[PDB]
Design a protein around this ligand. Structure first.
Ligand SMILES: O=Nc1c(NC[C@H](O)[C@H](O)[C@H](O)CO)[nH]c(=O)[nH]c1=O
Ligand SMILES: O=Nc1c(NC[C@H](O)[C@H](O)[C@H](O)CO)[nH]c(=O)[nH]c1=O
Ligand SMILES: O=Nc1c(NC[C@H](O)[C@H](O)[C@H](O)CO)[nH]c(=O)[nH]c1=O
Ligand SMILES: O=Nc1c(NC[C@H](O)[C@H](O)[C@H](O)CO)[nH]c(=O)[nH]c1=O
Ligand SMILES: O=Nc1c(NC[C@H](O)[C@H](O)[C@H](O)CO)[nH]c(=O)[nH]c1=O
Ligand SMILES: O=Nc1c(NC[C@H](O)[C@H](O)[C@H](O)CO)[nH]c(=O)[nH]c1=O
Ligand SMILES: O=Nc1c(NC[C@H](O)[C@H](O)[C@H](O)CO)[nH]c(=O)[nH]c1=O
Lengths: 154, 154, 154, 154, 154, 154, 154
């Protein structure tokens, strides 16, 4: 059987992170986790490109520009959506996730999903560096693995 | 009437399996089922290519690379999604299923769906080699049928 | 370790199917599934012998005649029992299952069990080609596996 | 595909009927139905052998003697069990059905089941020539079919 | 039509009775009824062989020895089972009835069933010489009929 | 007093294991336990013969072939039955246990019972390597003891 | 990978058992199990040293003396604590378990835990040779494994 997989050492890997500013008190924890994951897995901080955008709605268009760079191996999408009173949350969550997934396939490059889509503020806190981990750290780890995988797969 | 169908003998067929690591204790049973189905239907294990990715989110982009290979007749997607407290599950389940379906049409190649999308852990267990079967085995059997069908249809 | 197993290709295998007429609108779907399973697994339809009997009660005695044939590799028992108002169902279900199992051991030949024993009509429909599969297809697949296994085991 | 089945014309067929006397007011209707079914399907009444026994318990041992006769093509078992206050009914119903089924397999000869096993008197009446038919007639029709089937199968 | 039946005169008939000692205050009434039935139907008491055993569990093995005697025309099994707190009753009732039925078929000799299987003590009393008759008397009458029947049938 | 018993050291003992594939995610743990029990009790893995069958229904006929081998000292039956919506479970559980027990007596060779018969999935998990142990390990230990016992007893 | 494990044959192994007298009617069953486990796994009974003490409280200080013996390979602690009306149970259960564990580490020698700590008498009975096994047998089996493991590990 042929088996392809990615290791978790990030030596030489270059990452794009797109992080939204809405709910920054939480997003900022996700960005810390992502960078920490990259660096302590051996990636250089100098090899990270961070792009900030207003909200989750704007993440895809910026990710699309990063993912098109030949010297970016994977993109990590980071944001925090918390449900308000209207279905505003639903349309933005739907389109951010669809855009990111579509770009990854179109550009044949890993784009990982560190966007929280929480019904409540408490759930968002849980996932931004507390009891349910740090989704930035998780999405970065996935990007490490995928970039390594893609060295042989792509 | 012209009738086209695929038999279930897998002699000479070559398969790509993309399997996620999230919920591996269940995904690993799905992979065992898929391989077993292929091998005991006459497919050679050497003609199987297994690609591992972090989570169901990452299955599509890897499947896209496999399905593009001229020496892969069909791709089998294997993963396990279990609903958490937030709609995180919904956005990932939606995008994994849409990506896989879109890729299949774009590449004109069968990509089968052995991704469990369960509301509960119990339901996932049921479908990963217990009372409700093994979705890996099922998706592999579908891929056998489709690859054979495609020998005359494509 | 010595390991014996049966593959699922049916080339050269010869099957007996005994199917009851009671509840034929469901039994007939089970017979379709059994024949389809055999044929698309590489067995020839000519190599199938189908014996029809009135009810599940009469399946064992017919199966006994088929299983004694040297050119029958396995027998597939197909019928549909649905509970009525009295324990009639219990005595027939008990005896059909015991007879088939006893014959298999006495004749040292696989006899598989595609007899539905349902409490309700809905449950029978579920198992005769709808949401819970086709018990004829399942019993045929088992018979394929057992006949192959028996080529080395018997 | 080889197909074996029994037609429903009874010309030249010879039947054994074993009928118990317990609950005779209902068993007697079952015997009328069985004979009528045979005769109007073309069987001669002279070719019917009727054996009377006390209760359903005694049906098997008498059926064993009839089924051993070379000039009997099939045996029809007729009796009526209605649940009393104790499990007496369960042990008799279990043993009558098991004995009959066992004899059929041991002697390789059809023995059909026109024994009512009712929880209530009403249910027994329903099945002895009223709204739910006549189980004697039914069991006779099955024996006609099986004897014909056995002309080629046995 | 050929018709076989047994009359109820017991002249010249020889019977075996196997009676258990558990619940003897009731079993003893069953033995009185059995002997009375035989004698007043014309059988000689000298032609009766009574075998006593500890409990219903031991009835079959003793009945097996009696029924094998060429000078015994039928065996009458007599015992009293009353449900206790555990399923002990179920396993013994099941096996006594199965053994007796099996022996009758194996030895091609009538063995009648005068074993009470009662849920309550009251039910046992009812059936041991009170309002619901005497099961010993009943089983003896059946044995008379069967022995006579067997003079022509066996 | 003469006392016969089996020790638990398995040096030189040869075992047959028959394992069903239905509910393999659990059966596979039972097989691990059985093999582990044999090997760490001093049995050689080379002296184990493993036979795979589709379902619990098919275990008896395969076990019958293994148990007939003069170089097999005991057979371990391993399977997992979990109750569905219908009495299907009952008829299979009944016949698997009956067949195995009957074969053991007919062949005068130990056949041990490592078949789980659970009302719920949770109960099956409990007994397949979690809180209520591993029934494969247990049945193997029993087979070790019985094979040793049989060295003097048989 | 280097892998260390203990087999379950006890040839040549020498055990210390410390058993308390409080609740002896249960403890005595635990001691029976422990000795039986050892002996039937190949250990000699002569190689067992049994030390009796008044209550679970006193088990540690005795185990400390046994575990210091160079010719003792492992110590098995056996006792039965059942909750009374006061927290007396808690303080003794806490100190017995702590002492044993501490001794094991200090002396670098396996000391296994066959002390029942039951809320009820029923629970104690269950674990002292009835439905939930025999904790003496379990703790002995552990000690056999650990002593063997320690032959390479220590
Ligand atoms: O509204 N709540 C959220 C949000 N709204 C802003 C939106 O993404 C966009 O910036 C504006 O619609 C303008 O285009 N953006 C988030 O990241 N999280 C939220 O929870
Ligand atoms: O969250 N639950 C699940 C999960 N999340 C991980 C996700 O697929 C992706 O790896 C990350 O978002 C990073 O891109 N992936 C699954 O396969 N199943 C789940 O049940
Ligand atoms: O009654 N219901 C059922 C039925 N009774 C007919 C029976 O098997 C037999 O043919 C007669 O007793 C005559 O011997 N047979 C079935 O297969 N399914 C049923 O649900
Ligand atoms: O009891 N109820 C029934 C009955 N008991 C008699 C029994 O079959 C046997 O004749 C005696 O036990 C003596 O051997 N026999 C029936 O056919 N139907 C019944 O409903
Ligand atoms: O237990 N209750 C009953 C009983 N138990 C004894 C049993 O038959 C046997 O003798 C012993 O198990 C020893 O083999 N025997 C009966 O006839 N009736 C009962 O109601
Ligand atoms: O249905 N549930 C179960 C199952 N049915 C399959 C059956 O044993 C047999 O393979 C078929 O009837 C074909 O003969 N087999 C099991 O081992 N466990 C189950 O829980
Ligand atoms: O009290 N109940 C228990 C008990 N008390 C005695 C105690 O261990 C000690 O011997 C005295 O305190 C004197 O030192 N010892 C037990 O083993 N089990 C009990 O359930």
């Amino acid at each position: 059987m042929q088996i392809y997989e990615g290791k978790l050492t990030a030596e030489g890997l270059r990452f794009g992170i797109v992080a939204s500013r809405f709910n920054h008190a939480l997003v900022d924890r996700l960005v810390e986790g992502a960078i920490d994951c990259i660096v302590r897995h051996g990636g250089r901080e100098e090899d990270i490109t961070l792009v900030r955008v207003p909200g989750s709605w704007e993440i895809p268009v910026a990710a699309g520009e990063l993912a098109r760079k030949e010297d970016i191996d994977a993109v990590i999408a980071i944001g925090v959506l918390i449900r308000g009173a209207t279905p505003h949350f639903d349309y933005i969550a739907s389109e951010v996730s669809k855009g990111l997934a579509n770009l990854s396939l179109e550009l044949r490059k890993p784009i990982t999903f560190g966007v929280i889509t929480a019904d409540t503020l408490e759930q968002a806190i849980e996932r931004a560096g507390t009891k349910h981990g740090n989704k930035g750290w998780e999405a970065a780890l996935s990007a490490i693995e995928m970039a390594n995988l893609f060295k042989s797969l792509r």
